[PDB]
C-alpha cells in the first residue's frame, strides 16, 4: 500500500477519458495504417516506450480569468525525445500519445482546470470555448497524476514524415479562479507535463538516413547553444552577438534576410565579401585638389553583377545616407575602408585610400537627403576624411571592404546605430508588428567606432552597439532548406533559453522575424550567463511568451 | 416512402470511423425525409448548346437543415440527392 506522495516512472495515475477515445478509431487507424506494411518498433517491453519523459512546465496564478489558455500542444512525434530520434529512419507514422499532468499544490487552495481535445480544422487561440467541448475537470488539490490520451484524428491513411497533414491539438484552460484563502504574496502554482507513446503508435516504411535529412524537416537545430553564446554573428555587421534588443514600435529588414520559404527580397548573398561596382560618376567639390573630399554615385537598377537582384551591388548596407559636408564627422553612419578604381583595366587609384561612408540618397548632384524606398533612389559614397586628388571619370568604379564601423563625432558612444526609422527597404517586403504582448527583437553586437578604435565592451567611455535582424547561421540555414510544411501563418516556432537565474522564450514567425514577450520595455537583455537552449515546437501566435529573469 | 442510398455507401461508412461513431443518423427524422428548396437559375433562348447554366460543389451548405446542423460538428461524409423543377409551358422545346 504505497502512498500518493511517491510516484513511479511507469505510473499513469488516474486515467481520465474523453468521448473522442473510441474503439472504432483504433481499429480503423491500425487497419488503414496497414498499407505501409507491418508495424515497426512495436516491442512492448522496451525502456523507451514504458516510461514517461519530461515535456514542459507552466504557471497558474490567481489573476487568470476563466477561459484563459494555459497550455497547448500539437500532435507530433517531436513531443517525445525518443520518437524524434527514431523518425530519421522511417517515412511514415501513425498513432496516439499520452500526456501526464502533475499539479504542485496543497490542500488549502481552491480552483479547477479543464482539458479537451480539439479536432483538426479548428483555429486555436483566444475565444476558443473549451467548456463546450467534451472535457475533464481537474482540481488544484489533486495528489496523484492525471493522464489523458490524444488519439489520431486524421484524414490521411498515414502521416508522411516531411508532410504529416492535419492533426488534433490538446488545450488546457481555466475552469474556476485559483483561490488562496490566506491572501498575500504566495499566489502561483506549477504544473508539469510528461509524455509517453500509446499502445498503437508505430512507424511503417524504412529508408536510408542519407535521404531527406533532419535539417530539412524542422528548423530546431538551426538555433543551438553555441550560436547565441560564442560562435554566431549578426547578419548586418558581422560581429559577435552579445545581447537582445527589444523594438516596441516595429521594423522591416529586407537585405540579407530570409523567410521560411527559401526566398529573399534583398540584394545580398548570405556572406560577407567585397562590394564591387563599375560605371558610376565620380567627382570632387571645389577646385583645389589637396585634402579634398571624394564623391561617387550610381543609379539603382543598373548594377549587373548579382544573379539575385540589381537594386544595389552585393554587400551594400541597407542604411539611409546621412548627409554631411565640411569638417564634421556624421552621427551613426556606415563607414568602411576602400578606394576608387579605374574601369578600363581594373587598376586601383593608390592615392585615393580613405574611409568612405555609404548609403541611399535621392539627389546626388543636387541637395542631399536620405531615402528609404529603393524606387527612384541611388547609391552614394563619400569619404569622411580628407583624401589626395580626385578622379572625374564618368564610368569610374568603387571598391569597398566587407565589414564596417560606426561613424561617431566624439569619443563617447551613442544608441544602437540601426534605428527602425532609417532602414532602406525594397517595396514588397512585410513588416514585423506586435502580436498582443509579443514584440519583435533584434540581435545586438559590440561594434567599434571611428572616434575610438580601442573601445570594447565594458569600457569607461560607453559601449557601442549595432543590431541585426537574424543571426548569420540561421539565415545561412534558411537559404539551403525549405520549411513550408513546418509552420502555419499565425504560429511561432518556440525555443526555451535558460540562464543562471531565470528563463525566457523566443519565437520565430513564417516571415523570418524573432519575437519575445516583454511588452513595452526597451532594456537590453544581457545574454552572458546563458546555459542551455531547447526547442519546443509550434505554438499559437496570440499567446504570451514567458519572460521572467528570476 | 423509399430512401435512396449511394453506390459506394458501405465503404463510405467504414472509412469514416476514424472520426468516431456516426451522429444524427436516424432514418425516420423529418428533416431528412423531405425535399426542401435550395436555389434557382435561368434558361434563356440565347444559350448555345453545350453552355453551362448551373454548377454546385459537394457541400453540407446545399440544404437548409444540414447547414444549421454543421455549426456544431467538425466533420461530414456521405451523399446528397438533387431534384429539378421546370416552370415551363407546353409551347416550348429543348
Amino acid at each position: 500500500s504505497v502512498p500518493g506522495t511517491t510516484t513511479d516512472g511507469m505510473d499513469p495515475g488516474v486515467v481520465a477519458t474523453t468521448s473522442v477515445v473510441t474503439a472504432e478509431n483504433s481499429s480503423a487507424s491500425i487497419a488503414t495504417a496497414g498499407i505501409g506494411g507491418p508495424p515497426q518498433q512495436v516491442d512492448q517491453q522496451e525502456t523507451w516506450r514504458t516510461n514517461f519523459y519530461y515535456n514542459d512546465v507552466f504557471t497558474w496564478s490567481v489573476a487568470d480569468a476563466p477561459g484563459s489558455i494555459l497550455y497547448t500542444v500539437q500532435h507530433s512525434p517531436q513531443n517525445n525525445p525518443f520518437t524524434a530520434v527514431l523518425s530519421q529512419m522511417y517515412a511514415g507514422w501513425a498513432g496516439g500519445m499520452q500526456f501526464r499532468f502533475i499539479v504542485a499544490g496543497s490542500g488549502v487552495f481552491g480552483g479547477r482546470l479543464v482539458a479537451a481535445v480539439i479536432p483538426p480544422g479548428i483555429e486555436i487561440g483566444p475565444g476558443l470555448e473549451v467548456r463546450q467541448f467534451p472535457h475533464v475537470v481537474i482540481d488544484a488539490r489533486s495528489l496523484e497524476p492525471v493522464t489523458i490520451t490524444m488519439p489520431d484524428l486524421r484524414p490521411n491513411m498515414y502521416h508522411p514524415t516531411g508532410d504529416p497533414g492535419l492533426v488534433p491539438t490538446l488545450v488546457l484552460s481555466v475552469y474556476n479562479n485559483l483561490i488562496n484563502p490566506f491572501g498575500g504574496s504566495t499566489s502561483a502554482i506549477q504544473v508539469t507535463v510528461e509524455t509517453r507513446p500509446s499502445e498503437d503508435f508505430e512507424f511503417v516504411m524504412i529508408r536510408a538516413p542519407s535521404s531527406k535529412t533532419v535539417d530539412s524537416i524542422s528548423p530546431a537545430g538551426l538555433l543551438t547553444t553555441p550560436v547565441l553564446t560564442g560562435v554566431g554573428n549578426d547578419n548586418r555587421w558581422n560581429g559577435q552577438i552579445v545581447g537582445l534588443q527589444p523594438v516596441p514600435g516595429g521594423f522591416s529588414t529586407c537585405n540579407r534576410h530570409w523567410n521560411l520559404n527559401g526566398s529573399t527580397y534583398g540584394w545580398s548573398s548570405p556572406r560577407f565579401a567585397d562590394i564591387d561596382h563599375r560605371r558610376g560618376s565620380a567627382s570632387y567639390p571645389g577646385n583645389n585638389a589637396t585634402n579634398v573630399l571624394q564623391f561617387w554615385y550610381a543609379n539603382a537598377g543598373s548594377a549587373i553583377d548579382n544573379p539575385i537582384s540589381q537594386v544595389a551591388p552585393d554587400g551594400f548596407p541597407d542604411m539611409s545616407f546621412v548627409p554631411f559636408n565640411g569638417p564634421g564627422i556624421p552621427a551613426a553612419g556606415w563607414v568602411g575602408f576602400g578606394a576608387i578604381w579605374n574601369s578600363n583595366s581594373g587598376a586601383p587609384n593608390v592615392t585615393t585610400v580613405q574611409a568612405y561612408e555609404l548609403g541611399f540618397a535621392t539627389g546626388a548632384p543636387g541637395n542631399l537627403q536620405p531615402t528609404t524606398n529603393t524606387s527612384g533612389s541611388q547609391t552614394v559614397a563619400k569619404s569622411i576624411y580628407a583624401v589626395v586628388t580626385g578622379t572625374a571619370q564618368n564610368p569610374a568604379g568603387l571598391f569597398v571592404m566587407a565589414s564596417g564601423v560606426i561613424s561617431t563625432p566624439s569619443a563617447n558612444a551613442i544608441t544602437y546605430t540601426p534605428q527602425p526609422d532609417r532602414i532602406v527597404t525594397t517595396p514588397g517586403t512585410p513588416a514585423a508588428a506586435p502580436v498582443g504582448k509579443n514584440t519583435p527583437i533584434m540581435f545586438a553586437s559590440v561594434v567599434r567606432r571611428t572616434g575610438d578604435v580601442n573601445a570594447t565592451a565594458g569600457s569607461a567611455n560607453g559601449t557601442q552597439y549595432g543590431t541585426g535582424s537574424q543571426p548569420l547561421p540561421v539565415t545561412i540555414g534558411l537559404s539551403l532548406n525549405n520549411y513550408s510544411s513546418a509552420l502555419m501563418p499565425g504560429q511561432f516556432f518556440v525555443w526555451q533559453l535558460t540562464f543562471a537565474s531565470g528563463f525566457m522564450e523566443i519565437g520565430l514567425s513564417v516571415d523570418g522575424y524573432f519575437y519575445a514577450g516583454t511588452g513595452a520595455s526597451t532594456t537590453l537583455i544581457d545574454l552572458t550567463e546563458l546555459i542551455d537552449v531547447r526547442p519546443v515546437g509550434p505554438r499559437p501566435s496570440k499567446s504570451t511568451l514567458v519572460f521572467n529573469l528570476g | 416512402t423509399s430512401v435512396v442510398t449511394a453506390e459506394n455507401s458501405s465503404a463510405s461508412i467504414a472509412t469514416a470511423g476514424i472520426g468516431g461513431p456516426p451522429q444524427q443518423v436516424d432514418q425516420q427524422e423529418t428533416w431528412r425525409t423531405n425535399f426542401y428548396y435550395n436555389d434557382v437559375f435561368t434558361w434563356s433562348v440565347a444559350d448555345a448548346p453545350g453552355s453551362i447554366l448551373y454548377t454546385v460543389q459537394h457541400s453540407p451548405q446545399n440544404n437548409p437543415f444540414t447547414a444549421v446542423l454543421s455549426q456544431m460538428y467538425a466533420g461530414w461524409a456521405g451523399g446528397m440527392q438533387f431534384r429539378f423543377i421546370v416552370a415551363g409551358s407546353g409551347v416550348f422545346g429543348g
Binding site: 481499429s27 480503423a28 487497419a31 496497414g34 | 465503404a11 467504414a14
Partner: peptide, 10 residues
C-alpha cells in the same frame, strides 16, 4: 484491424 475488414465484409 480485423473488426474493420469484418464490418466491411458483413
Amino acid at each position: 484491424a480485423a473488426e474493420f475488414f469484418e464490418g466491411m465484409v458483413h
